């Protein structure tokens, strides 16, 4: 539905039919997330990973009462043009899930 990223990425998401939004700091990103969930942000709400390292921090208030929204981090326009190390993100996920490093 709605994606929060840099304005250049927002233009592309509007081209794709998604409700793209422009943002460059955590405050307006959190405000947009709050107004989306308050107005009924439907399911997927993508947020630029370099903007909000963990989008769920603004969802902790509403995560208890709802399960519909799904938020995941993703690279922006300029961020994706450089190498993205998603494997470290997976390692962090596994370390949080189990409590030990699992790969070398």
């Amino acid at each position: 539905m709605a994606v929060i990223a840099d304005p250049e990425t927002a233009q592309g998401f509007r081209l794709a039919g998604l409700e793209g939004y422009g943002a460059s700091s955590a405050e307006e990103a959190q405000s947009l997330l709050e107004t989306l969930v308050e107005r009924g942000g439907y399911a997927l709400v993508a947020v630029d990973e370099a903007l909000l390292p963990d989008p769920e921090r603004a969802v902790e208030r509403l995560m208890r009462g709802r399960d519909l929204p799904v938020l995941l981090p993703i690279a922006g326009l300029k961020e994706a043009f450089q190498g993205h190390d998603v494997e470290g993100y997976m390692r962090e996920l596994v370390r949080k899930t189990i409590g030990f490093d699992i790969k070398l």
Partner: protein
């Protein structure tokens, strides 16, 4: 009756004996002999016997014994993770520790009573085996520090020489020990 150690006879016995060699059925189930559990067993004659070990075996014998005991303790400390996620999910150091412990268990603690030459072992042969194991562990850790893969270490040919050490005759042991010691340092440094 029942194997409980809280029974009064066992409690009274353990307060006056100097040693306790805990035989275990679990070790015998996996065909490990003479099946003395090293986690539960203990002895109180080490401190008094240390000077005799220094005089008649080697000056560094207590250090080798303590190193072997510490390696076994560290191997036993990791048993939770190797049971939860498996051995292949560990790092290089953890896998090296597990494999060193396995080599120790299969080549030093284990002994065949019915074997012609392996039935009896002197102090010199045990000291040589412990020194060989410790030297190989040091070389393997150095190779790991130099970026060598764990699988490459686990396929070296000197491990067979180490494994056959306990089946070597008592009088012919020193030459075998010297050759194995030379091969241990040759296998790592020459390959580079």
């Amino acid at each position: 009756p029942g194997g409980d150690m809280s029974e009064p006879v066992t409690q009274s016995t353990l307060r006056i004996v100097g040693a306790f060699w805990r035989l275990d059925a679990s070790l015998a189930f996996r065909r490990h002999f003479p099946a003395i559990n090293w986690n539960g067993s203990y002895s109180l004659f080490t401190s008094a016997l240390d000077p005799w070990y220094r005089e008649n075996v080697a000056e560094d014998y207590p250090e080798l014994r303590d190193a072997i005991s510490e390696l076994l303790q560290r191997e036993a400390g990791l048993q939770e993770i190797v049971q939860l996620v498996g051995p292949d999910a560990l790092q290089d150091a953890e896998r090296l520790v597990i494999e060193v412990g396995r080599i120790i268990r299969e080549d030093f603690l284990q002994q065949n009573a019915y074997h012609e030459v392996d039935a009896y072992c002197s102090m010199k042969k045990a000291y040589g085996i412990m020194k060989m194991i410790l030297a190989f562990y040091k070389e393997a850790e150095a190779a790991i520090k130099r970026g060598v893969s764990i699988d490459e270490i686990l396929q070296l040919p000197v491990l067979e020489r180490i494994g056959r050490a306990r089946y070597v005759s008592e009088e012919e042991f020193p030459a075998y020990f010297e050759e194995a010691m030379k091969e241990i340092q040759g296998a790592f440094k020459a390959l580079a």
